[PDB]
Amino acid sequence: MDEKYVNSIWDLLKNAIQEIQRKNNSGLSFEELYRNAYTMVLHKHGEKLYTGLREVVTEHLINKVREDVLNSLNNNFLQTLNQAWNDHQTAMVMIRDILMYMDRVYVQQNNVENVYNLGLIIFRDQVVRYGCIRDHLRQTLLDMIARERKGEVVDRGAIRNACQMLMILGLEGRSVYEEDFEAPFLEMSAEFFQMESQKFLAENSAS
Amino acid sequence: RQINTEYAVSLLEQLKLFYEQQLFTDIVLIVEGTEFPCHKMVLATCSSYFRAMFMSGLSESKQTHVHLRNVDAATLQIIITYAYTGNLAMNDSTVEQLYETACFLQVEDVLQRCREYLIKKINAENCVRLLSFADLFSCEELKQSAKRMVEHKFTAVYHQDAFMQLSHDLLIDILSSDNLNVEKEETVREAAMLWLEYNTESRSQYLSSVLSQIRIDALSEVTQRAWFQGLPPNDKSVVVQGLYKSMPKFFKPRLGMTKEEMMIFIEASSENPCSLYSSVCYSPQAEKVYKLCSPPADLHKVGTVVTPDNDIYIAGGQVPLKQTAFRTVNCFYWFDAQQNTWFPKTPMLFVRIKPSLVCCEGYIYAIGGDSVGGELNRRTVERYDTEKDEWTMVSPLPCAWQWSAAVVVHDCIYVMTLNLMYCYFPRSDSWVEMAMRQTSRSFASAAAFGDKIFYIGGLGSSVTVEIYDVNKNEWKMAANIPAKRYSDPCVRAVVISNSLCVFMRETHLNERAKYVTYQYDLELDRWSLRQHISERVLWDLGRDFRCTVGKLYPSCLEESPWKP
Amino acid sequence: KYTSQIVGRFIKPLSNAYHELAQVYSTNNPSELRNLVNKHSETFTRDNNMGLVKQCLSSLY
């Protein structure tokens, strides 16, 4: 139909998506969004919807979770990051479900990644691989694992959550997580074990 | 392990019983005031939308009443029962809405079943409707299957009303494609012109694009001032625009203008001894022998027919059963003039061996052909409907005949046997006695040229020719073909270049077969040497090979590599 | 094997009877050879010489 109709449909869909991302998915109708998604892609305008999706998602991430992570980099930095990841995942579940139907027609003809993969990629680019968050996360994980190796016990389930989050963030396998996590960890472990070996060879014997 | 069959049906019938008897119902579908008590289990087993409707965590996850909108009650009921009993009753009318709800509910299995049905149902009268349907919903396999069938069938008809209501992108793909089958490049021009003039100035912006896909041999001649007449007033952004616009876009002739009158041969002698037979063709103009696709599953003992619309069909035949071993099958196939492949069609009711395929009034008539029945009506004459894609029986022939040939003259079926002839009247479905021949000859072929029947040869064969006139109803002799003595010519009657020519292969004593064709003078009653087929291009074909008149594209086909 | 051209290709299809005479000659049976000669008496008559066939029989003897 006219461009005004599709613009209004997209505008309300964007408002509904933003409302869902604001932890207000209770009072919102699913059939209306599915029907509007049906009539939006039916008119062969999936490129505009996909482009609008990416802009809305990245704008929400930069506004909400980018500020939140930087604001609490010292007060439960890893706990807040896991909570934001869980909030992003549970919000993207309904976002993907509506747009997986869009994906069925889109990715099989346009040959692009799915919306769930798109959300993981943009989250990796804007949160984990940030110019300041990446180094801060690397430094704090090395510090706590070194303190754990020293002899005192710290939280261990959170690290398992963090590595699992990074593994899911890889989205293809063990390409991103392995380089981001192991490479600083191998260097830290190499020096720690080398210094430990040097101390042990002089303070003890082969017994 | 494979999961048990016996427990599967026992549970399956319990799925149906619990549905027809409304007991374990927790969710009900509210559609236009119609109650659909069902289960969350079965609905999302087939549908990929109900799994995102129930196991999503939305308000509907707890709500037991959903108002499903923009759906049909009949389509939902057949989909629901298909999820419950597995039976998908697909008619010829509701498949359109069946696909609409299947895509809406994202139900994969019914989508494949209805897509396959639409692949079988594609034809001339719904090609435009299905292509637009294949454009509305992304069904690329059907879209490509339609587009190929669409491309040929538009050019033939180009008068259907649904062609006007088409998207701009679809028309650009259709017109700019190199698969159109047209005798001239002007019929596509006027087809575009009438489409542009079908509506108001909403076609003005698409006109700068539709002409950008048509060749420039008509973008400077007539049908440029006609648009100026239909131009919106005082618009100076179009008349000057098209004045200096038709410089680029590389004039090149299309592919549809390459249908030369060629002699299609079937069951020819296979060059490689690994295969039994092959199919070749002779080019009366190119003087070359182009290869053809093998008959479907090496279908031997078949018959050929070419409709006035230049379409090739194959009926009857036998396949070697899995040393002599052959089983007769009633499979039917259609030849693709561009893809060089045989598309399967609706099979016949009875199997045939060497059937006489004759086209008349758009119906394909197969007369006789050594049917399997052998009852009192051991003829089994039956026509084929190219409109509904089905076979309908016709009036049985008065007498049982073997090794017979049939032609069509004056919208009537003329079948010839050893000495008798009967004419079939399609309007009343009756047979009338015709003239009697004075010579007992069989194993011959006849070609219908104008309003006369030319029975050439008969018994090897000979040079006896008996000409029959429909308006006169009499058999008369004309002459005998001058051939080398002590030989066994293989006569083949065919009509080519608006003249009666003969494809006669002769073999001398202890000599190889020689190929030569002659042109029979209708008024002078004499066979004149039209062309001599050199043996450097055409090799031996055999004895049980058939010949027919038709048009084929040398570009799509490939030359057969074989030594002279 | 220094051979010739299509002369070789066509004539073997052409002179079958003379090859047929050789085949029976290889069977080495004057009675059978004479019967074949009578069967193909007219074929060898297109030779301007029939004595060669008799000389062939004498050579077989």
- In chain C the first and final C-alpha atoms are separated, in Å, by 32
Residue C55: which region, alpha, beta or left (left: phi > 0; alpha: psi -120 to 50)? alpha
Chains C and A touch (3+ CB pairs under 8 A): no
Distance CA B298, CA B332 (A): 13
How far apart, in whole angstroms, are the C-alpha atoms of residue B502 and residue B478? 15
| Spatial contact of B410 and B426, defined as CB atoms under 8 Å apart | no
Which chains contact C through at least 3 pairs of Cβ atoms less than 8 Å apart?
Answer: B
A35 vs B69, B138, B140: nearest CB: B69
Tokens 């082969």 correspond to: A206
Q: Is residue B382, in this structure, part of any structural domain at all?
A: yes
Q: Is residue B231, in this structure, part of any structural domain at all?
A: no
In a domain, B215, yes or no: no
Residue type, B106: Q
Q: What is the CATH number of the domain that holds B549?
A: 2.120.10.80
Residues B510, B366 within the same domain: yes
Instruction: State both tokens at C39.
Output: 């069967």
B59 and A38: CB-CB below 8 Å? no
Does residue B369 contact residue B378 with C-beta atoms inside 8 Å?
A: no
Close Cβ partners of B23 (under 8 Å, ≥ 6 residues apart): none
Task: Pick the residue from chain B with its C-alpha nearest to A37.
Answer: B104
Q: Is residue B225 part of a domain?
A: no
Q: What is the DSSP string of B338-392?
A: TTTEEEEE---SS--SS-EEEEETTEEEEE-S--S--STTTT--EEEETTTTEEE
In a domain, B241, yes or no: no
> Does residue B167 sit within a domain?
no
Laid out side by side, the sheet with B27-31 consists of B34-38, B27-31, B65-67
Considering B136, B161, B178, which residue would you say is the last residue of a domain?
A: B136
**CB–CB contact B66 A31 (8 Å):** yes
CB contact under 8 A, A93 and B106: no
C-beta separation of B146 from B134 below 8 A = yes
Question: Is the same domain home to B418 and B554?
Answer: yes
- B285 DSSP 8-state letter: T
Method: cryo-EM
Residue B403 identity: W
Specify the CATH number for the domain of residue B91.
3.30.710.10
Last residue of one domain, picked from the residues B72, B103, B136: B136
CA closest to B512 among chain C residues = C13
Final residue belonging to a domain, choices B136, B152, B168:
B136
Q: Identify the three-state secondary structure at position B303.
A: strand
Amino acid at residue number A152: E
Q: Are B359 and B305 in contact (CB under 8 A)?
A: yes
Chain A: residue whose CA lies nearest to B47: A101
- For chain A, list the contacting chains (3+ Cβ pairs, <8 Å): B
**Dihedral pair phi/psi, residue B499, rounded to 5°:** -150, 160
CB distance A97–B136 less than 8 Å?
no
Which of B69, B106, B137 is facing A31, going by the closest CB pair?
B69
Name the CA dihedral angle for A174, A177, A183, A188, rounded to a multiple of 10 degrees: -130
Query: Does residue B268 lie within any of the structural domains?
Result: yes
Number of domains in chain B: 2
- Determine the structural domain holding residue B132 and report its residue range: 5-136
Q: What is the DSSP string of C20-42?
A: HHHHHHHHT-HHHHHHHHHHTTT
> Nearest CA to CA, how far is B39 from chain A (Å)?
19
Residue B59 lies inside a defined structural domain of this protein: yes
Chains that touch B (3 or more CB pairs under 8 A): A, C
Q: Which of B49, B67, B140 faces A109 most closely, judged by CB atoms?
A: B140
Tell me which chain A residue has its CA closest to the CA of residue B134.
A42
Q: Which of residues 15-54 of C touch B (CB under 8 A)?
A: 16
Cα(A170)–Cα(B347) distance, integer angstroms? 54
**For the residues of B253-278, what is the DSSP string, one character each?**
--STT--EEEEEEESEEPSSTTSSEE
